[PDB]
Design an enzyme around this catalytic site. Structure first.
Site, PDB file in Angstrom:
ATOM      1  N   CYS A 190      -7.614   7.175  10.585  1.00 53.79           N
ATOM      2  CA  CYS A 190      -6.280   6.661  10.271  1.00 53.79           C
ATOM      3  C   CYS A 190      -5.369   6.905  11.474  1.00 53.79           C
ATOM      4  O   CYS A 190      -4.497   6.098  11.783  1.00 53.79           O
ATOM      5  CB  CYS A 190      -5.697   7.332   9.028  1.00 53.79           C
ATOM      6  SG  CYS A 190      -6.609   7.301   7.462  1.00 53.79           S
TER       7      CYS A 190
ATOM      8  N   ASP B  32       1.644 -17.676  -7.514  1.00 55.05           N
ATOM      9  CA  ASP B  32       0.396 -16.989  -7.198  1.00 55.05           C
ATOM     10  C   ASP B  32      -0.518 -17.064  -8.423  1.00 55.05           C
ATOM     11  O   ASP B  32      -0.112 -16.685  -9.531  1.00 55.05           O
ATOM     12  CB  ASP B  32       0.701 -15.529  -6.833  1.00 55.05           C
ATOM     13  CG  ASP B  32      -0.437 -14.850  -6.094  1.00 55.05           C
ATOM     14  OD1 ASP B  32      -1.612 -15.186  -6.353  1.00 55.05           O
ATOM     15  OD2 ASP B  32      -0.149 -13.961  -5.259  1.00 55.05           O
TER      16      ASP B  32
ATOM     17  N   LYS C 112       0.525 -14.585   3.863  1.00 48.21           N
ATOM     18  CA  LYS C 112      -0.908 -14.824   3.721  1.00 48.21           C
ATOM     19  C   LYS C 112      -1.800 -13.615   4.062  1.00 48.21           C
ATOM     20  O   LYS C 112      -1.655 -12.984   5.128  1.00 48.21           O
ATOM     21  CB  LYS C 112      -1.314 -16.065   4.542  1.00 48.21           C
ATOM     22  CG  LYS C 112      -2.801 -16.453   4.464  1.00 48.21           C
ATOM     23  CD  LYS C 112      -3.070 -17.818   5.116  1.00 48.21           C
ATOM     24  CE  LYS C 112      -4.487 -18.338   4.803  1.00 48.21           C
ATOM     25  NZ  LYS C 112      -4.660 -19.811   5.026  1.00 48.21           N
TER      26      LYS C 112
ATOM     27  N   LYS D 298       2.652  -8.936  -0.112  1.00 46.20           N
ATOM     28  CA  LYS D 298       3.500 -10.012  -0.640  1.00 46.20           C
ATOM     29  C   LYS D 298       4.084  -9.780  -2.036  1.00 46.20           C
ATOM     30  O   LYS D 298       5.287  -9.921  -2.251  1.00 46.20           O
ATOM     31  CB  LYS D 298       2.737 -11.327  -0.648  1.00 46.20           C
ATOM     32  CG  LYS D 298       3.607 -12.566  -0.714  1.00 46.20           C
ATOM     33  CD  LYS D 298       2.914 -13.668  -1.481  1.00 46.20           C
ATOM     34  CE  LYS D 298       2.513 -13.132  -2.835  1.00 46.20           C
ATOM     35  NZ  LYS D 298       2.355 -14.181  -3.870  1.00 46.20           N
TER      36      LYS D 298
END
Ligand code: ZN
Lengths: 302, 72, 288, 63
Positions: A236, A54, A23, A28
């Site tokens: 970063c 999806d 999620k 994913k």
């Protein structure tokens, strides 16, 4: 210790059912993709199917090819085939060809889940029969929101009230295969950030309650800013510190797990070629020092 | 009666909405998708209020019965 | 339209109770801090209290000063005072079949205890506060209690709930970052507050990059991130229209000490603008 | 002996809850997540004890 990659799964021959779930925008899909590709290449003898529910229909975007209802071989591959399918549309059509049904069904959990699922299965079988060719292992690109598999409790709640069939008998068939750790497993995707990790444990716990094997976490978008030759962005760097901070927590919390720490390829990974190049690091864990260029070369093209 | 008639209508509209939302990408359509969710959490209220009223339109009708025989 | 800042709240004189909440590492604390500071500066005539229950005890880290049980004036300020307090420790000191189970019971007991503690602070000091700013805990449901010693409780809660339902008296400020998972958690929260009949009108959106208006234009990665952040801003915009959504910038690294906390909290009042306000941030970072 | 234990669990669970509420889940995700796992356990143990007692009533009552 347990290896920090998914090599044992990619090489496994016992698995029919591999679920990939995650999620909230954590990789994913390219994870689903990457696994499927690696398995296929590692096991050229078998036939693999990447199926996705999806709604974003993004196997097509990942591969830059257009898949759909009809299982089709991924171009430039000879054992990986993909289908994108919307189960609601499949279930709805079944109701169509077939408001009172909703008083009883609509309410109960896993009912619509299971109907929807069964429908998908049916659809797959139809694909094999007509083709004359069958698949050896499917890889499910699960939907990022919902509880696709909370129907794996139905067989328990339906025998309880039966004392107080076609479906419950199907589900118990499924559940028998899905409880076999050698037959089917789940792979969680997440990123090294509190909110995602939390959602991830929630998921693991839920799967454990369904008696589904869950042994592997993929941790995407890692920066490895220490081992970076640009050492550029102070921002970063500062982010990498968070990411790191939680890796250390994850480590002592899913010890017996295969947690794969994947790198952040800046921008987007599309097309078989790059998806492939990138999916190698699920097998042999990425190493910022030696493997850097591979990523910097994926980005710089982008 | 008119209460059951409506309860079914709600229970049905809610369902139809659910399935429609399951076809939208919550990440690519957070606003739209979040809206429809808000509409569902509404319908669940409306539907749980109708259900409670009916259960209590039983208690209301039922009180008109034990009143008859054994009020005597 | 509604203004993209918190100016109307910072200047408000009617509010006694301002809650700052945000799950998952989104700026919550320096937000609590920033609001408190701006209010205090904007309303020098009033006395403000920043109180925090967050277990990380990080008002002390934010201010680089050591606060605790005892309300103490923030050094270099004359109307802002801070206390860090753990309510469990307070409730436990005061001390299951009946209580332990019921929701909001332990919540309410815990809360009442805090209140009591505050009052004790004012009485002894001889000085009272005009407005508190609650740095809520990042996990839990501090306020789900808004749904002889029995009666005693329910009567207290109804007293509280009366003040907490008055939009002119008390409001909630959500913190989040422009990322699906946080946004989701954020709506969940708004909904929950709305159910408690608490006023919720303001979202702070931290850690924004504004990579387009940046002169380093350096990191291809932060650019790509900025695109996500943006993508959702656009969603947030059409979904909380009548809301005050403040889009705060990302100051890389950490904001500590009154000075920088102050410099930074100005952008809750007059919305930050990457073009003119850039340096202010690049100057906060480059010191770090 | 069943009531005696049910209270002990219900109490240990409570004490744990409050201890966890004093830990920073963001600064102690591992520790904190562990303690949560222990709680979801105790809730099971406590809901099983409660169910057994309710059914040790049905057992006595049948006599
Ligand atoms: Zn950067």
């Amino acid at each position: 210790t347990v290896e920090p990659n998914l090599h044992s799964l990619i090489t496994s021959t016992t698995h029919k059912w591999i679920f990939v779930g995650g999620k909230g925008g954590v990789g994913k899909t390219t994870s689903s993709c990457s696994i499927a590709i690696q398995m296929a290449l590692s096991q050229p003898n078998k036939q693999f199917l990447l199926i996705s529910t999806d709604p974003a229909h993004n196997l097509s975007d990942a591969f830059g090819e257009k898949f759909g209802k009809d299982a089709r071989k991924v171009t430039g591959m000879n054992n990986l085939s993909c289908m994108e399918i919307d189960p609601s549309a499949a279930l709805k059509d079944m109701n169509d060809m077939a408001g009172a049904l909703a008083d009883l069904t609509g309410s109960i959990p896993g009912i619509d889940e299971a109907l929807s699922f069964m429908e998908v299965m049916k659809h797959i079988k139809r694909q094999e029969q007509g083709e004359g060719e069958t698949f050896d292992t499917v890889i499910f690109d699960t939907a990022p929101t919902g509880h696709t598999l909370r129907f794996l409790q139905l067989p328990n709640t339906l025998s309880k009230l039966l004392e107080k069939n076609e479906l419950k008998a199907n589900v118990e068939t499924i559940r028998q295969q899905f409880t076999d750790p050698d037959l089917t497993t789940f792979v969680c995707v997440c990123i090294s950030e509190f909110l995602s990790l939390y959602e991830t444990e929630r998921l693991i716990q839920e799967l454990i309650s369904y008696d589904m094997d869950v042994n592997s976490i993929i941790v995407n978008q890692l920066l490895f800013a220490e081992n970076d030759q640009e050492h550029n962005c102070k921002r970063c760097q500062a982010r990498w510190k968070m990411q790191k901070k939680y890796l250390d927590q994850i480590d002592e919390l899913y010890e017996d797990f295969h947690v794969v720490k994947m790198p952040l390829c800046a921008g987007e990974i599309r097309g078989l070629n790059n998806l492939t190049k990138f999916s190698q690091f699920l097998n042999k864990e990425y190493n910022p020092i030696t493997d850097g260029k591979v990523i910097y070369e994926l980005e710089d093209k982008e | 009666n008119e209460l059951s008639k409506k309860y079914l209508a709600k229970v049905k509209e809610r369902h139809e909405l659910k399935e429609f939302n399951n076809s939208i990408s919550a990440q690519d359509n957070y606003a739209k998708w979040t809206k429809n969710n808000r509409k569902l959490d509404s319908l669940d209220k409306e539907i749980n209020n109708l259900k409670d009223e009916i259960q209590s339109e039983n208690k209301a009708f039922q009180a008109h019965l034990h009143k008859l025989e054994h009020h005597h």
